[PDB]
Design a protein around this ligand. Structure first.
Ligand SMILES: O=C(CCN1CCN(C(=O)OCc2cc(Cl)cc(Cl)c2)CC1)c1ccc2[nH]c(=O)oc2c1
Ligand SMILES: *[C@@H]1O[C@H](CO)[C@@H](O[C@@H]2O[C@H](CO)[C@@H](O)[C@H](O)[C@H]2NC(C)=O)[C@H](O)[C@H]1NC(C)=O
Ligand SMILES: [Ca+2]
Ligand SMILES: [Cl-]
Ligand SMILES: [Zn+2]
Ligand SMILES: [Zn+2]
Length: 777
C-alpha cells in the first residue's frame, strides 16, 4: 500500500519503496507511480521546440519544456532555446575541433558517460543514411568509430541489451532470448507480460549495479515505452543539471526505432528514411542540449545498437509440418531461430533422436539446420543454460521457421556472424580518440570500456580487458599477461624401444616453428616439450596427447602422400614413458574409433623427417567420420593457406568440453574414453592459423602486426551437419570449418592455454588479435 504525489519528484534517481509511491522512469512498468505522475511529469504542451514568439517567456508550468529567461537556471529549457532565442548555432553546424581534455564546468570531477542505444540499428545505416543523419554523422566522423560491432547470438533485443550492460554471453547472464522457459521456475519469460520484471531471470552484474556498489551514482538504464524520446533526453539533461552530490556519472537513452519500422517495412524501405531522421533529430537535441549546458566538450557519448535487420517475408518460411509427422506434439520458439521442446502431457513416445533425424538434410535447398545445442558452433556460446532447449534449429538468413501454416517485411535473430545482423558503435568525447576508425569488435567487450570511462573495477565478464585500449585517448587499463602455473619438462632420450609393448608396428626448430613463444599452461598439470625437425609439441602426461602442436609451413612447402609401408605406422617416443603413452591395441579393439595426427605427415620436410610424424606422442583419437575432415584440412587446406598468406604458422590440438560450458574440462569432467583405456576422446579439435598482416613478408620472418584465422571443429561420430558429406571432401569440408570459425580467445578458455607471449607487439594489440573472428562475409 502506497500514498503521496510527484510534486518536485519527477524522474527521481533513488528507487523509493513503500509506504511512499514511486516517481522514477520505470514506475509505469511496475504500475507503481503516484496518482498524478502523468499530469506532473509527462507534460507535452506546446511541443518540444522554442519558436521566436516563445522567446523572453513568462513561465507556464503546463509546458513540456520552457523558453523563459529562468529556464537555464532550473535546467529545463527546450534543447533549441539558445539557438532560436540567443543566436547560438546548432551543434551539427559547428566544425569539429579536437577534445584533448574534458572541458567541463565547475563541480564535474570526471567526464560523464551517456550510452545512446538504438534498437535494430543495422551497421550499413551509417553510410547509407549519412545525408539524412547529419548529427550522427558528425559523432561518427569526428569521434572514434568502427565499421561495425558484432552482437551476441541470438541477435535479439533482450539478450543483446543485457549483454551490453553486463559484458556476458546470454548463456551466462540468463536472458537467452526474447522468449524463454525455465524448467526450475516452471514459468515463461515474454515480451508481453509481467514475468520479465522479476529479477530472478536477470543474472550477472549490470553496469549500473557495478557503479553504485563502487560508490558511483548511476540508476537503471531501462525506460518505460510510454515516455517519449524528447522527455527521455530532457530528463537526462535535467539530471546533468542536478547538484554535485546528486548528479549521476552514467546515463542511458533507448530508442525503439529503427527496429519497430524495420519489422514492418524491411531494413531499407522508402518508409525507413523518416525513422532515421527522427533518431538523428533526437541526437541533435542531446548535443544542442549538452552545448546549452556547456557539456558538449565534457561528456563521453557512446552511440551503440543491439543488432541489425534482415529482409524477411512470409513467403520465405519453412514449415516443420513438412518434415515431422506429429508437429502438434512439440513446442517451438519460431522465427529467425528455432528452439524445440516436447509437450508434457500424454506424449511418452517423444524422442529427440527422431526429431533431429527427421529434420536433417531432407530438402535439397533446406533453409535451416538442426543441432543439439552442444554441437552448435562454439563461437555462438549458446549452450550452458537450462533455459536453452536441447534441440536448436539454426535458420538461414532471410528465412523463417514455423510449425505449420504479410504482417512484416524485416526481422532479426539469425547467426551473429551475418552481415545484416551487424550493428554500430561510435565513441565521441575527451576520453575517446578524434577522427579515428577502429577495427570491428564484439559487443561483449564494451562493458569493460564503460567501466574504464567511469573508473570502475569491472565485475567478472566475457570481455578481454585491454583489447579495446586503441579506442581510448586516456584512462586505459594496463593489461597484465597471466602468469604460467605449470612449468614444462624437457625430457631427453630416456627409454629403449623394447620397453614399449603398445601393440604398435612400423618398418623403420624453435625459431622456425614456435614463432610467438610457447603457449603458457594456466592450470596445474604435468607436460613435456617435444622438439622435432618440422614441429614442436607440448605433450600432456595426464591426457596422453599434445595440448598444442606448433608448426610453420612456408609459401613453397611440399605436399606429399603417406607411403604404403607407413600406412599403419605408429612409432614409440623414446623421450616419453610407456605408462604415459597411447597404445595401438585400444584403437584395434575400439570399432567406432580410429586415430589421426596433429602434425600432418603430408607436410614433412623429407622422407627421413616424415618418421617423426608417426610418433605415438603425435597421434590423437579421431572418429573415421571426423578423420575425413581433418585429413582434407591437413592434406589440401593448410598448404592452400600457406600459399595465399605467404606462409602460415599452425597451432593444433584437442579440446575437452563435455559439460558444454565453454571452459576447459577437469580430468573428472571427461565423459568418454577410447575402449578399455585411459586415452580420453576430445569433444573438439582446434587450429590457430597465424601469419604476417604484411603479405610481402614471410610468416617466420615477420615484423609488424600479425594476421590470424582459427576454428574449433566439433569431434563427431558422423558428418550429419554437412549435407554434402556423401561427396568428395573438397565440396563440403571447408564450408564446415567456416561455420565453426573461432577466436584465439575462445580456444584459450577451452584449453587453459595462453598464446602470443613472445612477440614484438604491444600486449593490447595482442589482446585485440586474440578477440578477432574471421567471419568469411
Ligand atoms: O518492446 C520492446 C522493448 C522492450 N523494452 C526493452 C528494454 N528497455 C530499455 O529501455 O532498454 C534500455 C537498456 C537496457 C540495457 Cl540492459 C542496456 C542498454 Cl544499453 C539499454 C525498455 C523497453 C521490443 C523491442 C524490440 C523488439 N523486437 C522484437 O522482435 O520484439 C521486440 C520488442
Ligand atoms: C563468461 O564469464 C562468466 C563470468 O566470469 C563465466 O561465468 C561464471 O563461471 C563460473 C564457473 O562456472 C561461476 O563460478 C560463475 O558463477 C559464473 N557466472 C557468473 C555470472 O559469474 C563464464 O564461465 C564465462 N564463459 C566463458 C565461455 O568464458
Ligand atoms: Ca567444460
Ligand atoms: Cl527468442
Ligand atoms: Zn532489438
Ligand atoms: Zn525487433
Amino acid at each position: 500500500a502506497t500514498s503521496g504525489s510527484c510534486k518536485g519528484r519527477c524522474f527521481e534517481l533513488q528507487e523509493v519503496g513503500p509506504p511512499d509511491c514511486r516517481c522514477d522512469n520505470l514506475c509505469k512498468s511496475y504500475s507503481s507511480c503516484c496518482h498524478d505522475f502523468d499530469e506532473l511529469c509527462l507534460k507535452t504542451a506546446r511541443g518540444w521546440e522554442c519558436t521566436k514568439d516563445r522567446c523572453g517567456e513568462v513561465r507556464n508550468e503546463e509546458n513540456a519544456c520552457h523558453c523563459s529567461e529562468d529556464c537555464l537556471s532550473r535546467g529545463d529549457c527546450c534543447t533549441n532555446y539558445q539557438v532560436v532565442c540567443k543566436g547560438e548555432s546548432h551543434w551539427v553546424d559547428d566544425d569539429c575541433e579536437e577534445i584533448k581534455v574534458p572541458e567541463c564546468p565547475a563541480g564535474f570531477v570526471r567526464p560523464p558517460l551517456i550510452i545512446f542505444s538504438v534498437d535494430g540499428f543495422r551497421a550499413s545505416y551509417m553510410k547509407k543514411g549519412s545525408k539524412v543523419m547529419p548529427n550522427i554523422e558528425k559523432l561518427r566522423s569526428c569521434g572514434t568509430h568502427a565499421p561495425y560491432m558484432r552482437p551476441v547470438y541470438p541477435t535479439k533485443t533482450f539478450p543483446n541489451l543485457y549483454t551490453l550492460a553486463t559484458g556476458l554471453y546470454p548463456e551466462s547472464h540468463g536472458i537467452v532470448g526474447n522468449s524463454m522457459y525455465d524448467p526450475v521456475f516452471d514459468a515463461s519469460f515474454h515480451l508481453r507480460g509481467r514475468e520479465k520484471f522479476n529479477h530472478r531471470w536477470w543474472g550477472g552484474q549490470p553496469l549500473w549495479i557495478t557503479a553504485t556498489k563502487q560508490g558511483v551514482r548511476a540508476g537503471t538504464f531501462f525506460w518505460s515505452v510510454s515516455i517519449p524520446h524528447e522527455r527521455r533526453i530532457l530528463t537526462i539533461l535535467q539530471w546533468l543539471s542536478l547538484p554535485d552530490n546528486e548528479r549521476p556519472s552514467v546515463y542511458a537513452f533507448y530508442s525503439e526505432q529503427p527496429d519497430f519500422s524495420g519489422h514492418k517495412y524491411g531494413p531499407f524501405g522508402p518508409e525507413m528514411t523518416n525513422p532515421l531522421r527522427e533518431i538523428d533529430k533526437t541526437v541533435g537535441q542531446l548535443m544542442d542540449g549538452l552545448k546549452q549546458l556547456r557539456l558538449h566538450r565534457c561528456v563521453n557519448v557512446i552511440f551503440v545498437g543491439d543488432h541489425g535487420m534482415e529482409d524477411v517475408t512470409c513467403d520465405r518460411t519453412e514449415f516443420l509440418s513438412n518434415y515431422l509427422t506429429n508437429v502438434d506434439d512439440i513446442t517451438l520458439v519460431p522465427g529467425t531461430l528455432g528452439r524445440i521442446r516436447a509437450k508434457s502431457i500424454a506424449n511418452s513416445k517423444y524422442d529427440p533422436k527422431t526429431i533431429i533425424a527427421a529434420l536433417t538434410c531432407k530438402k535439397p535447398d533446406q533453409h535451416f539446420k538442426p543441432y543439439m545445442k552442444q554441437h552448435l558452433p562454439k563461437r555462438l556460446h549458446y549452450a550452458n543454460n537450462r533455459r536453452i532447449e536441447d534441440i536448436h534449429l539454426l535458420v538461414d538468413r532471410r528465412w523463417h521457421v514455423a510449425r505449420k501454416p504479410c504482417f512484416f517485411q524485416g526481422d532479426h535473430g539469425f547467426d551473429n556472424k551475418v552481415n545484416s545482423m551487424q550493428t554500430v558503435f561510435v565513441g565521441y568525447g575527451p576520453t575517446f580518440k578524434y577522427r579515428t576508425k577502429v577495427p570491428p569488435f564484439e559487443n561483449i567487450e564494451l562493458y569493460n570500456v564503460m567501466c574504464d570511462l567511469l573508473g570502475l573495477k569491472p565485475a567478472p565478464n566475457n570481455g578481454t580487458h585491454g583489447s579495446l585500449n586503441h579506442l581510448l585517448r586516456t584512462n586505459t587499463f594496463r593489461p597484465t599477461m597471466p602468469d604460467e602455473v605449470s612449468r614444462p619438462n624437457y625430457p631427453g632420450i630416456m627409454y629403449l624401444q623394447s620397453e614399449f609393448d603398445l601393440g604398435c608396428t612400423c618398418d623403420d626448430t624453435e625459431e622456425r616453428h614456435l614463432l610467438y613463444g610457447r603457449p603458457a599452461v594456466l592450470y596445474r598439470t604435468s607436460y613435456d616439450i617435444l622438439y622435432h625437425t618440422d614441429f614442436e609439441s607440448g605433450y600432456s602426461e595426464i591426457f596422453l596427447m599434445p595440448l598444442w602442436t606448433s608448426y610453420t609451413i612456408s609459401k613453397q612447402a611440399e605436399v606429399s602422400s603417406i607411403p604404403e609401408h607407413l600406412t599403419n605406422c605408429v612409432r614409440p617416443d623414446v623421450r616419453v614413458s610407456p605408462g604415459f603413452s597411447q597404445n595401438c591395441l585400444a584403437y584395434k579393439n575400439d570399432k567406432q574409433m580410429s586415430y589421426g595426427f596433429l602434425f600432418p605427415p603430408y607436410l614433412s620436410s623429407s622422407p627421413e623427417a616424415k618418421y617423426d610424424a608417426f610418433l605415438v606422442t603425435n597421434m590423437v583419437p579421431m572418429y573415421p567420420a571426423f578423420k575425413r575432415v581433418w585429413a582434407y584440412f591437413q592434406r589440401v587446406l593448410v598448404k592452400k593457406y600457406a600459399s595465399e598468406r605467404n606462409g602460415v604458422n599452425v597451432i593444433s590440438g584437442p579440446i575437452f568440453d563435455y559439460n558444454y560450458d565453454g571452459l576447459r574440462d577437469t580430468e573428472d569432467e571427461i565423459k568418454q574414453y577410447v575402449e578399455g583405456s585411459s586415452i580420453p576422446v576430445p569433444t573438439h579439435y582446434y587450429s590457430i592459423i597465424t601469419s604476417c598482416l604484411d603479405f610481402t613478408q614471410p610468416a617466420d620472418k615477420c615484423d609488424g602486426p600479425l594476421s590470424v584465422s582459427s576454428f574449433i571443429l566439433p569431434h563427431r561420430p558422423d558428418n550429419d551437419e554437412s549435407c554434402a558429406s556423401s561427396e568428395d571432401e573438397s565440396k563440403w569440408v571447408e564450408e564446415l570449418m567456416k561455420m565453426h570459425t573461432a577466436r584465439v580467445r575462445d580456444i584459450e578458455h577451452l584449453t587453459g592455454l595462453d598464446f602470443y607471449r613472445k612477440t614484438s607487439r604491444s600486449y593490447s594489440e595482442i589482446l585485440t588479435l586474440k578477440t578477432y573472428l574471421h567471419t568469411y562475409e
